[PDB]
Design a binder for this molecule. Structure first.
Ligand SMILES: CC(C)(NC(=O)CN1C(=O)c2ccccc2C1=O)C(=O)NCCCC[C@@H](N)C(=O)O
Ligand SMILES: Cc1cn([C@H]2C[C@H](O)[C@@H](COP(=O)(O)OP(=O)(O)OP(=O)(O)O)O2)c(=O)[nH]c1=O
Ligand SMILES: Cc1cn([C@H]2C[C@H](O)[C@@H](COP(=O)(O)OP(=O)(O)OP(=O)(O)O)O2)c(=O)[nH]c1=O
Lengths: 738, 714
């Protein structure tokens, strides 16, 4: 028939032609129920006397995509269809893409617009010879579809509207954006970024090697002062960060509660309820412009406005008086948990009546708080369980507030010497020091935990621990060259140098190592997996101290005084790793990095390489993405449903009506039922259990979500108090129900 | 006892024309207190209260109601100024315990040395000069309050204001006091508030230009904004410089959300920081102009900064290009016959983001005004061509009240510290106007306001740099309505029109003669050289209005040509709401809005009628409880009731039936002797868009700076 080619000529569209043009790609697929026949069918069964070739692979790719439910290989295939009709549509070699990206011109103004950077490009052509050939473009056939169309949507820079990079072109520029002048490691960084041994978090990918590269995600802000001059110089600070697309965690603990005396202008303060709507509208003002930004507010429960802090995301409320786009978080000191569970009363205080109440934690905070109580100098006295179910009443309504434990989050941080951490980040994993002239930042890089497994289901620990070895130096260099939108951010992270190495797909990891997520083997691996990262991190940060000198303010720190993160948890480690010689190695030289581990949640940067989204296990065995609107079942799961033939259309529909609960239907081996157990089914005691076990080797904190489709009050009460009781820094990210 | 209170009562009824005043009916309504309880002051509490109720019978019951509250304010306040000042600095906040000096050591110290002459120069029978409703606006905020109890007397606060301004200058202090106390004028509200206090703010005015289009500049304007709302200041903001909705963002590759989500951050800011509200000045060429008049349809007041074109292409039924100040830069920053050439550029260059018929825009503004009242109308190309800061550059906005027109920049956020004139104190018991002292008093006020410039604690250093060079001062007025009424003029009359020419002339040449005097002493304001008046041509020349033979300006033109003036701008009629709800004079320059009005004192609601109306009504007997109701039924109008000699309903007519054609008339006739603008309110309660279209243009055809403040309906 009738398709106009890549030319401008015509070709007889034939089934024999297309089914073989797909057979060109199907390599690395068990091609036993993978079948290029029945792609071509629905395609040709709509092929009209028209329709070009690329605009036929629009059909061919998006059709093999929808038929991923037949096998998780079809997604990886539907990718190559779209990728190959991106390859023949994209410039073939790297230096030619880069040169073509800097000479970019904006057709609105005519203003010459450097997509990349002169700070980068000129080092790029400098090694054009080997760099260009050091790119295996056969590695963007290793991505799955639903990840690739997270890639091209916003990760692959386009020119005037259409794609300008290939995924490898994007990955190499990233590895060039990081090391710039360095090449022996730049291609090394690429050579792990490409075959997905890991990834840098979202912003490190976008504008690595653009002019003023902004390589940092979330940022942290303590309130400058208890002053409008300090407040709006804080408000400016964060508005600037959301300019440069930055997540933000703010300690607003420092602020005059509602009804607190103002000496300067003889009125009472308005509290945070009005002060925070200011941040609310700041958020959906400056997005970056084109989807919205949002900041995580960290108010400590001793603050008089804590109840009204909690009324703030009740679905639909009181209009002129309520905020939405802000995310809320609790920076909880041990004491509150204590006399909730002892059911003794609780004092609510103003940080001005009771000054310096946010800049103190733990045993030091036990008494300073009780000192005001004896003086009588508090505003509200309420039974501690009040504030407690009122929090749960807020969480059961929404999912917020977040739950961080200050006197667990400060007890076990390497930044203690700098003072009290008054807050965490947007997604509650980063626990760094913040102040008037300091706003520490997140240097983030996900780890694809599923990749370090043998085809014999044994773990490749000594490679995980040296990939991190590379991950740490990347994030170090990122600290220097990263554009800091605010001068304090620089002169913070330039000081402390905290980097946050996150992980993803430990959902997938447990599964592909053949472990049920709950098993006493997972458990048993969950240690060592995070022993591995931390070890490789400390080992890498140590080699860096002996080369560039320990960060500003290194000694004073827990490690400089000779006692490490797990030692703070009293959780003595496992003997993979000879920790004695690491401590000693850390001891002559030091470390370059204040904090290292931060299991940060990754969504887009997880969607991209098919791993399931942070540390959380699979939520629904069958789930969906939209870029049509495609059904996708768990890869792993269908991997085994087909190996032994228990997957039909009279099975797919059964699992959908289960929310992935493949536990009901008894034609599936209980070897798989245990293994692919949806997170809901998992009594979450064990998840936080696990978190605490792995948290011992986490410098900062870990963004943990909690899933119970049927959330009671005590069944939520006994949840937090498990996590807090057994040591966690971050108790809960979101609450998911239905 | 009944015969004990009535004695206690006209022991204060002196000066109150005792025919339609009667002391017994006061004692009668208070005996409902029934005694067997109530202190010695609770009596006098509701006794004043009772007298204030009866302003309905005579405006003298109000003045009496004052003294009652006042004579039992002096009872519960010690009687000497230096004492009051002493306890005001030796104040301790007992919620706390820390030392909190409510006045200033820097001023007390100044008080105690010149103590013996200051305390005696204070006349303490001038608190009796105020009337009740004025007195309890005073009670609330102006009189400093030691531990809840009023620590000051009106005198004690006013002498504090005098001493706060002159500081070491005592001879000029009793000066400013004796005409502050004899109500010959008054300073701005924040002045009377923190004059002589620790870290004093003496300004409200306050203007702001976006120091950029960038976030960095958006929030250092916002940082500045909250800082000023901290210091209890209302701001006019120039936001014309800001990216329209969707106008391509640079390195973030985003597109702008434009104005609306921005102003919402300012909205919320304006509500977060009280101890307030901001005005936002957006020129009609900005693209987001339609997303602009829907926000009004909130804590922000809105305003258009209109160039001559927009009107010229609204009459002529001609199109209109809405532009982005980024595609079409420097567009807000240019004015007049020149601006139209720059605007017509991007017209021909074609870079325009949305073009609509200009009259559609226009009625779209009338649609927002009829509902709300906003936006304020101020004519750009009509402000700068008649402004004395025309040399410093295009003035890009006005204040939150639209009387101030001052240059604003990267670090110059102009203030216009303020003081109003009691225009009704200048009359004879021979019904002729006293122009002599009006200059003389204005002579003083300029110098005080200029002392205020030097001592004022400025919230942002940018405001300091603006006031120290320009040294501008907004000298406003009040009781315009009462002046005509005491000169026995109708507001609309031609001898209202004579006099109003003259009235602002004497003020202008009173202020110019005053501003000329402290170029001698200190040296011309630094950016004098270049300004239109350093170029020997004044405000009334830019309107080309030949002044009255009243004064000899040829003399004044020629004083100024020598030494010069320490000030850039001089005249600027406020809307003196509280700042005038004290003396007994009608709010700014507008006529009597409604002959009978009511103010809410806490819980009570007292019927208060036009003090001159009733006092002329009663002179005839033709006033009563039926007359009374008939006037409230008209929401002000006394034209219905034919009993009234038709001479008096010319005199007291309300601004409703005062043909606005002719309000904007007199507004132009005085605007020539006004260095800045004028807060002009517009009043029609049944407003076809036709009326609004014709009243608006009458303004910019007549060359006004402010086309319109508020719209006012029902
Ligand atoms: C208030 C007044 C008329 N009467 C009182 O102090 C006490 N009293 C009575 O035994 C009595 C009986 C029946 C009706 C009303 C009253 C009443 O008021 C008074 O002047 N009583 C004289 C006693 C000194 C206190 C007093 N001057 C004050 O400051 O209120
Ligand atoms: C509404 C809105 C405006 N803006 C504005 C304010 C930012 O400073 C600007 C982008 O910053 P820049 O990229 O620095 O702006 P620019 O280089 O194009 O020139 P200018 O600063 O004068 O605009 O766009 C946003 O960035 N985000 C938004 O959501
Ligand atoms: C002016 C103002 C302050 N505040 C509160 C919140 C801020 O923490 C703080 C900043 O303003 P200030 O009260 O002026 O801060 P301050 O340290 O100078 O306190 P004081 O004047 O009593 O000596 O006041 C409001 O809540 N609303 C307001 O309008």
């Amino acid at each position: 028939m009738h398709v106009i080619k890549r030319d401008g000529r015509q070709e007889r569209v034939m089934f024999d032609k297309i089914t073989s043009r797909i057979q060109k790609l199907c390599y690395g697929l068990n091609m036993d129920f993978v079948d290029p026949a029945q792609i071509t069918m629905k395609v040709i069964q709509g092929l009209y006397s028209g329709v070009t070739t690329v605009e036929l692979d629009t059909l061919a790719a998006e059709t093999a995509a929808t038929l991923t439910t037949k096998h998780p290989d079809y997604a990886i295939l539907a990718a190559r269809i779209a990728v190959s009709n991106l390859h023949k549509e994209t410039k073939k070699v790297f230096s030619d893409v880069m040169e073509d990206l800097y000479n970019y011109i904006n057709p609105h103004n005519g203003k010459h617009s450097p997509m990349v950077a002169k700070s980068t490009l000129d080092i790029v052509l400098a090694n054009k010879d080997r760099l260009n050939s050091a790119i295996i473009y056969d590695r963007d056939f290793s991505y799955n579809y639903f990840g690739f169309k997270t890639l091209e949507r916003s990760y692959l820079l386009k020119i005037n509207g259409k794609v300008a990079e290939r995924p490898q072109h994007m990955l190499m520029r990233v590895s060039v954006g990081i090391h710039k002048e360095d090449i022996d490691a730049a291609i090394e960084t690429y050579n792990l970024l490409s075959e997905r041994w890991f990834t840098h978090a979202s912003p490190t990918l976008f504008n690595a090697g653009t002019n003023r590269p902004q390589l940092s995600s979330c940022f942290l802000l303590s309130m400058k002062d208890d002053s409008i001059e300090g407040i709006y110089d804080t408000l400016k600070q964060c508005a600037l960060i959301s300019k440069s697309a930055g997540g933000i965690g703010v300690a607003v603990s420092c602020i005059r509660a509602t009804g607190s005396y103002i000496a300067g202008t003889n009125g009472n303060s308005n509290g945070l309820v009005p002060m925070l709507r200011v941040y609310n509208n700041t958020a959906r003002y400056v997005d970056q412009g084109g989807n919205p930004g949002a900041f995580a507010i960290y108010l400590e429960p001793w603050h008089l406005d804590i109840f009204e802090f909690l009324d703030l995301k009740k679905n639909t409320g009181k209009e002129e008086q309520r905020a939405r786009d802000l995310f809320f978080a609790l920076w909880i000191p041990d004491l509150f948990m204590k006399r909730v569970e002892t059911n003794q009363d609780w004092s609510l205080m103003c940080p001005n009546e009771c000054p310096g109440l946010d800049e103190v934690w733990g045993e030091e905070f036990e008494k300073l708080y009780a000192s005001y109580e004896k003086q009588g100098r508090v505003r509200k006295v309420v039974k501690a369980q009040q504030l407690w179910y009122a929090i749960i009443e807020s969480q059961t309504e929404t999912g917020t507030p977040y739950m961080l434990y200050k006197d667990s989050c400060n007890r076990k941080s390497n930044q203690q010497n700098l003072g009290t951490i008054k807050c965490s980040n947007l997604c509650t994993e980063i626990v760094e020091y913040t102040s008037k002239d300091e706003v520490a930042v997140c240097n983030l890089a996900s780890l694809a935990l599923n990749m370090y497994v043998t085809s014999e289901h044994t773990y490749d620990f000594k490679k995980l621990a040296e990939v991190t070895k590379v991950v740490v130096r990347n994030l170090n260099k990122i600290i220097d060259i990263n554009y800091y939108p605010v001068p304090e951010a620089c002169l913070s992270n330039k000081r402390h140098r905290p980097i946050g190495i996150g992980v993803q797909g430990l959902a997938d990891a447990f599964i592909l190592m053949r472990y049920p997520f709950e098993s006493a083997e997972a458990q048993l691996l969950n240690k060592q997996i995070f022993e591995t990262i931390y070890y490789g991190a400390l080992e890498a940060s140590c080699d860096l101290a002996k080369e560039q000198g320990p960060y500003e303010t290194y000694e004073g720190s827990p490690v400089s005084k000779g006692i490490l993160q797990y030692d703070m948890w009293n959780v003595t480690p496992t003997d993979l790793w000879d920790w004695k010689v690491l401590k000693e190695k850390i001891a002559k030289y030091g470390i370059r990095n204040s904090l290292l581990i931060a299991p940060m949640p990754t969504a887009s940067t997880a969607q991209i390489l098919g791993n399931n989204e942070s540390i959380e296990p699979y939520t629904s065995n069958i789930y969906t993405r939209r870029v049509g609107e495609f059904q996708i079942v768990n890869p792993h799961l269908l991997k085994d449903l087909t190996e032994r033939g228990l997957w039909h259309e009279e099975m797919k529909n059964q699992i959908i009506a289960c929310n992935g609960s493949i536990q009901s239907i008894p034609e599936i081996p209980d070897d798989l039922k245990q293994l692919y157990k949806t997170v809901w089914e998992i009594s979450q005691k064990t998840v936080l259990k696990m978190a605490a076990e792995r948290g011992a080797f986490i410098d900062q904190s870990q963004s943990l979500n909690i899933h119970i489709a049927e959330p009671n009050y005590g069944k939520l009460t006994s949840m937090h108090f498990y996590g807090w009781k057994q040591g966690l820094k971050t108790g809960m990210y979101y609450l998911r129900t239905r």
